[PDB]
């Protein structure tokens, strides 16, 4: 079903990710030139259930066909080591790269790249995936600022769940929206890291007592009204993906709709005489 590649084909580059079970590399692949791609190695001596997970995720991806999910370009199964072979997204982790980037795109190019993420969460919510581990570390990002869902698998990163998630293990694609809710904050602040040096447990006594993230600078009244309400405590009040796709397509087809900031409660006063 996966297209199986020759490890012929496969040249492994760069080094660009983290390596228990292997690393994840930049190369190129044959298939006409060269295409860039992004590799994923499993090293001999791995499990049965490290075969099953990693195989598993390509499998997953294998079933997806969107602009905003990462494409698989195939497999490397046959022979050793194994490898997964995705395109490759030039500009890394979407979470570092905002951080890198800190002020440097407009309030339209932000909300672009949420319709982005939430049109790719709307497509998986519809296929009965639920991501479990939506974040903008988990987001990347090409050269066209094209965001795509990655992270794919089944087998608790506190300040992005949802309470139902937390309290008693129910993921569903509405805790992944509460997630997006914390994306859309992670996006319009340029990666602050959410809820700033609070404790996880500082965090959820927060969360179950009625705190929410406060509004970002610069950020569209209508981006932090929506953020908002996917934060409602109650799961089935919060929008379905296909709302904030709905809502985010709107505003940026209307992008004087963006202009109206929500006010910034500021942790600061300078006063001059
Ligand atoms: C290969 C694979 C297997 C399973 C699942 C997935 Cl999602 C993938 N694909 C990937 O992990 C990746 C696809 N594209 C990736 N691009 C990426 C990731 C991290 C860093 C960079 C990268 O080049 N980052 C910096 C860019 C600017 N400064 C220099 C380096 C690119 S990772």
Sequence with gaps: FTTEIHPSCVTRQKVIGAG????????????????????????????????????????????????????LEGVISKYKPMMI???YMENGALDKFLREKDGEFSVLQLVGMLRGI????????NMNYVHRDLAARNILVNSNLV???????????????????????????????????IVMWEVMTYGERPYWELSNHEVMKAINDGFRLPTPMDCPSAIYQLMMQCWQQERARRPKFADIVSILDKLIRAPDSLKTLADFDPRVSIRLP
């Design 118 to 125: 939430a049109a790719g969460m709307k497509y998986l919510a």
């Design 20 to 71: 228990e079970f292997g690393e994840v590399y930049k190369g190129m692949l044959k298939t006409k030139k060269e295409v860039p791609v992004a590799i994923k190695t499993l090293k001999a001596g791995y499990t049965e259930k490290q075969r099953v997970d990693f195989l598993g995720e390509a499998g997953i991806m294998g079933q997806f066909s969107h602009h905003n999910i990462i494409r």
């Design 85 to 87: 072979i995705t395109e």
């Design 147 to 181: 965001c795509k869902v990655s992270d794919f698998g089944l087998s608790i990163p506190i300040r992005w769940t949802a309470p139902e998630a937390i309290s008693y293990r129910k993921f569903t694609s509405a805790s992944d929206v509460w997630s997006f809710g």
